[PDB]
Protein backbone atom coordinates (compact mmCIF):
# COMPACT_ATOMS: atom_id res chain seq x y z
CA UNK A 1 0.00 0.00 0.00
CA UNK A 2 0.97 3.62 0.50
CA UNK A 3 2.68 3.92 3.90
CA UNK A 4 1.83 6.57 6.45
CA UNK A 5 4.95 8.61 7.30
CA UNK A 6 5.30 7.45 10.92
CA UNK A 7 4.09 3.94 9.97
CA UNK A 8 7.16 3.60 7.70
CA UNK A 9 9.46 5.16 10.28
CA UNK A 10 8.85 2.27 12.75
CA UNK A 11 8.93 -0.35 9.96
CA UNK A 12 12.47 0.62 8.93
CA UNK A 13 13.26 1.13 12.63
CA UNK A 14 12.67 -2.54 13.47
CA UNK A 15 14.70 -3.49 10.36
CA UNK A 16 17.85 -2.07 12.00
CA UNK A 17 18.30 0.97 9.72
CA UNK A 18 18.65 3.91 12.20
CA UNK A 19 22.27 5.17 12.07
CA UNK A 20 23.05 2.31 9.66
CA UNK A 21 26.43 3.14 8.10
CA UNK A 22 26.08 6.59 9.81
CA UNK A 23 22.76 7.49 8.08
CA UNK A 24 20.02 8.40 10.60
CA UNK A 25 16.46 7.05 10.38
CA UNK A 26 15.36 10.41 8.93
CA UNK A 27 17.71 10.00 5.91
CA UNK A 28 15.93 6.72 5.03
CA UNK A 29 12.33 7.85 5.52
CA UNK A 30 13.10 11.14 3.69
CA UNK A 31 14.50 9.17 0.72
CA UNK A 32 11.30 7.11 0.56
CA UNK A 33 9.07 10.22 0.13
CA UNK A 34 10.92 11.58 -2.89
CA UNK A 35 11.92 8.19 -4.39
CA UNK A 36 8.48 6.52 -4.20
CA UNK A 37 6.11 8.82 -2.23
CA UNK A 38 5.80 6.04 0.39
CA UNK A 39 4.40 3.66 -2.31
CA UNK A 40 5.45 0.01 -2.14
CA UNK A 41 4.22 -0.67 -5.75
CA UNK A 42 6.00 2.34 -7.40
CA UNK A 43 7.93 1.66 -10.63
CA UNK A 44 9.62 3.80 -13.33
CA UNK A 45 11.17 3.12 -16.77
CA UNK A 46 14.60 4.55 -17.46
CA UNK A 47 15.86 5.09 -21.04
CA UNK A 48 18.66 2.47 -20.65
CA UNK A 49 16.04 -0.33 -20.76
CA UNK A 50 16.21 -1.08 -17.01
CA UNK A 51 13.48 -0.65 -14.39
CA UNK A 52 13.19 1.16 -11.06
CA UNK A 53 11.13 -0.57 -8.33
CA UNK A 54 9.55 -0.35 -4.90
CA UNK A 55 9.77 1.92 -1.86
CA UNK A 56 13.41 2.95 -2.51
CA UNK A 57 13.48 2.72 -6.36
CA UNK A 58 16.18 0.00 -6.52
CA UNK A 59 17.26 -0.08 -10.19
CA UNK A 60 17.41 -3.41 -12.07
CA UNK A 61 20.58 -2.74 -14.15
CA UNK A 62 22.68 -3.56 -11.00
CA UNK A 63 20.66 -4.96 -8.10
CA UNK A 64 17.63 -7.24 -8.89
CA UNK A 65 16.38 -9.65 -11.63
CA UNK A 66 13.20 -8.92 -13.64
CA UNK A 67 14.07 -10.79 -16.87
CA UNK A 68 13.67 -7.56 -18.91
CA UNK A 69 17.15 -6.04 -18.49
CA UNK A 70 19.93 -7.31 -20.80
CA UNK A 71 23.54 -8.00 -19.71
CA UNK A 72 22.98 -7.08 -16.05
CA UNK A 73 24.06 -8.35 -12.65
CA UNK A 74 21.99 -9.36 -9.63
CA UNK A 75 24.03 -8.13 -6.62
CA UNK A 76 21.32 -8.33 -3.89
CA UNK A 77 20.32 -11.76 -5.34
CA UNK A 78 16.53 -11.25 -5.50
CA UNK A 79 13.79 -11.10 -8.14
CA UNK A 80 12.68 -7.47 -8.75
CA UNK A 81 9.05 -8.48 -8.03
CA UNK A 82 9.99 -8.90 -4.30
CA UNK A 83 10.76 -5.16 -4.08
CA UNK A 84 7.04 -4.56 -4.90
CA UNK A 85 5.74 -6.59 -1.86
CA UNK A 86 3.95 -4.74 0.99
CA UNK A 87 6.41 -6.17 3.56
CA UNK A 88 9.58 -4.09 3.16
CA UNK A 89 12.14 -6.78 4.20
CA UNK A 90 13.66 -7.43 0.73
CA UNK A 91 13.95 -3.71 -0.04
CA UNK A 92 15.74 -3.09 3.31
CA UNK A 93 18.04 -6.13 2.97
CA UNK A 94 19.22 -4.93 -0.50
CA UNK A 95 19.47 -1.21 0.37
CA UNK A 96 21.84 -2.21 3.25
CA UNK A 97 24.09 -3.78 0.59
CA UNK A 98 23.66 -0.79 -1.78
CA UNK A 99 24.59 1.85 0.87
CA UNK A 100 27.69 -0.17 1.93
CA UNK A 101 29.09 -0.17 -1.66
CA UNK A 102 31.24 3.00 -1.16
CA UNK A 103 29.11 5.91 -2.45
CA UNK A 104 26.72 5.76 0.56
CA UNK A 105 23.27 7.38 0.14
CA UNK A 106 24.35 9.10 -3.10
CA UNK A 107 23.03 5.93 -4.84
CA UNK A 108 19.55 7.47 -4.56
CA UNK A 109 19.07 10.59 -6.77
CA UNK A 110 15.90 11.91 -5.02
CA UNK A 111 17.81 11.65 -1.70
CA UNK A 112 20.87 13.49 -3.03
CA UNK A 113 18.71 16.17 -4.62
CA UNK A 114 16.06 16.77 -1.92
CA UNK A 115 17.34 15.32 1.39
CA UNK A 116 21.17 15.66 1.80
CA UNK A 117 22.28 18.52 4.09
CA UNK A 118 18.78 19.40 5.40
CA UNK A 119 17.00 19.12 8.78
CA UNK A 120 16.57 15.34 8.51
CA UNK A 121 14.86 15.02 12.00
CA UNK A 122 11.65 16.91 11.01
CA UNK A 123 11.04 13.66 9.17
CA UNK A 124 10.78 11.61 12.42
CA UNK A 125 8.97 14.19 14.60
CA UNK A 126 5.51 13.34 15.89
CA UNK A 127 6.04 9.56 15.71
CA UNK A 128 6.55 7.38 18.77
CA UNK A 129 9.81 5.39 19.04
Residues annotated within the binding site are 101
Burial of 116 per CB tally in 10 Å (0-12, 13-18, 19+): middle
Domain containing 83 equals 1-129
Number of domains within the chain: 1
Q: Which experiment gave this structure?
A: electron diffraction
Q: Is residue 27 a contact partner of residue 56, using CB atoms and an 8 Å limit?
A: no
Residues found in the chain: 129
Query: CB neighbours of 87 closer than 8 A, spacing ≥ 6?
Result: none
Choosing from 18, 35, 66, 119, the catalytic residue is: 35
Q: Note if 35 is an active site residue.
A: yes
Resolution, in Å, please?
A: 2.1
Residues annotated within the binding site for substrate are 101
Q: Note if 7 is an active site residue.
A: no
Residue 32 maps to which CATH number?
Answer: 1.10.530.10
Q: Is residue 83 a contact partner of residue 4, using CB atoms and an 8 Å limit?
A: no
Choosing from 52, 66, 87, 119, the catalytic residue is: 52
Amino acid sequence: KVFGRCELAAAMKRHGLDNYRGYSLGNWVCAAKFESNFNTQATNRNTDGSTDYGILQINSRWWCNDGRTPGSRNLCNIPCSALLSSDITASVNCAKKIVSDGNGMNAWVAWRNRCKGTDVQAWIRGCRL
